[PDB]
Amino acid sequence: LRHWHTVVLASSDRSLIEEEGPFRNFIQNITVESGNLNGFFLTRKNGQCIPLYLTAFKTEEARQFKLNYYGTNDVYYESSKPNEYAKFIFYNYHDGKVNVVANLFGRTPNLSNEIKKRFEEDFMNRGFRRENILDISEVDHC
């Protein structure tokens, strides 16, 4: 779980992942430190690209983490092929309101259409609009 790229972002609240949104972050590296996930991202804030470091701390159960950011978050990791892609589902609690932000990471800037399609269908199968899924592999970003 080293070198990564954010390929697709999906959220119950589109603004969370729109330009300069709190969850429009682009992963660069993920370091596992004592079961915790040390993430290094880049993000655009007021006209520039800036570094963002966040640690998702382990919990009583594997693949589930806790992260303090834009409130609190329950983080779940998933992947059939851990060396090809990584999926992180964030349930963000911001002042009493809950939102889900799904992240699809790839070893390179893009991922197979198969992986991306299933990721996107799963999101849509949960009642979310296609407009809320942002494939950033086809977009220039930080």
Added chain:
Amino acid sequence: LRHWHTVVLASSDRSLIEEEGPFRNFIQNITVESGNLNGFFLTRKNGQCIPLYLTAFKTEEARQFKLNYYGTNDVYYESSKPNEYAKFIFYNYHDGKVNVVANLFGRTPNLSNEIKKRFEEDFMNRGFRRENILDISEVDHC
């Protein structure tokens, strides 16, 4: 996962678990079938306690399930004391809106103070009012 009782309900949207709420259901039994969880609950409607049968389907993750109810739900099972209690977290997706409904089940109508307190503070630590936690152990319910 036999005999169970709903002891505490907690939700990001209080109305979901108050009277007439879609998630104010009382577990009676949980039967495992092919990795799936077949739950039998009671629901209060028009003065009567009515049966509610729902199957939470397995996934590529042992304690994770999928459930079609009041929209769709990603369900997670947790418990450090499997024969004493069961915790089920429902991330509900209804009309593009996300809500979290946590259920604490006991072998009997009530549960250890230690278990209930940990459950309750974990929920509160995510920015929710104590108002959103309903301990029904002493409430006359189905």
